[PDB]
Structures are given as C-alpha cells and as structure tokens.
Amino acid sequence: SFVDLGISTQRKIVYELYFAVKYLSKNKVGAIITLQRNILLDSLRTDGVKIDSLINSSLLIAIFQKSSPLHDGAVIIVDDRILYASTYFSVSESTLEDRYGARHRAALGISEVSDSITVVVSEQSGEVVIVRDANFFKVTNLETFTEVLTKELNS
C-alpha cells in the first residue's frame, strides 16, 4: 500500500492526482478516483476496463472528459498505476444531502467495505471531497489537497 511505496513514488502519485483534480474541479468535470490500500478491491467492483497505466494527470483528465468512453464509473489506482477505469461499486444504502449524487453514494459504498480512499469531483459544482471509512472530507482550498490526501493515505 501507499505507506510501503518509496517517497518519490508517494510524491508522484499525490502530485499527479492534484493536477488532475485541479483541472477537473476548475472545469466542473465529474470524477471518481479510488485508491486501493490493504483491502483488495478486485472482488468489490464490476465491469470496467483494465488500463494498467502509470499514473499521470493528463491521462486522468482525458479519462473523465464527456467525449471519453471511460468517463462513467470509477478509476481504481493501485500503487502508482491507474489499474481500472469505468468500474462500478455497490452504492451505499445511506442517504446523503441533496447536493450529493450517485458518484458520492458510489464512493461511500466502496469506503464502507474497504480501507480505500476515494476522491470525488462533483460535476455540478466542481466540489472535491475525499471519502474514507464512510466519512466525507471537503477540500475547499485545493492548495491543501496534497496535504490532506497524503494524511489520509497514511492513516
């Protein structure tokens, strides 16, 4: 998991996610990006496309554009690799405030059955939340994104 990775790989992962999330939030492009940790997600997802790409912000941006056939569903990141795109989780049965949608219910569902950390970008507002252990954490100042994500990945 993340804590096992070398520091340069740790920093690369958060940096590429930051630059992708910055673009997606700014342009109000919806996204679900799940980082696997100790619980293997392979048996907790359905459908999707195996990509097995090195993590890169440009590719993550491309994946979630509306003209991309991969923009629906979730990206799964394992270590420094974008392993899957367009994969689907069992959504949470919990009810959320009206401002949240299916991306958040999906992120909540996978966080309920795993120790994964999920980043959601809202298509409506560009709002960015980090989802872990059935909890939301709003990231209103994206200049703190790198700090907050790293802390969550080390919990």
Ligand X SMILES: Nc1ncnc2c1ncn2[C@@H]1O[C@H](COP(=O)(O)OP(=O)(O)O)[C@@H](O)[C@H]1O
Instruction: Tell me how far CA of residue 119 lies from CA of 27, 35, 53, 115, in angstroms.
Output: 16, 8, 18, 13
Q: Which of 91, 113, 142, 148 binds ligand X (CB under 6 A)?
A: 91
Judge whether 88 is annotated as a binding position. yes
**Residues counted in the chain:** 155
What's the number of CA atoms in the CB half-sphere (13 Å) around residue 103? 27
Judge whether 136 is annotated as a binding position. no
The beta strands (E) that lie in the chain are given as 31-35, 45-46, 49-54, 74-78, 81-89, 117-121, 128-132, 135-138
Using CB under 8 A as the binding rule, whether residue 63 contacts a second copy is answered as yes
Per CB under 6 A, which region of 15-23, 35-43, 102-110, 131-139 contacts ligand X?
102-110
Least separation in angstroms between CB 53 and a second copy: 4
Q: Which of 19, 88, 136, 137 binds ligand X (CB under 6 A)?
A: 88
Using CB under 6 A as the binding rule, whether residue 116 contacts ligand X is answered as no
Which of 102, 89, 110, 106 lies closest to 47, judged by CA?
A: 89
Judge whether 23 is annotated as a binding position. no
Count of residues that interact with a second copy, criterion CB under 8 A: 22
Using CB under 8 A as the binding rule, whether residue 67 contacts a second copy is answered as yes
Structure tokens at 80: 């420094």
The contact set with ligand X (CB under 6 A) reads 30, 32, 72-74, 88-89, 91, 101-103, 106
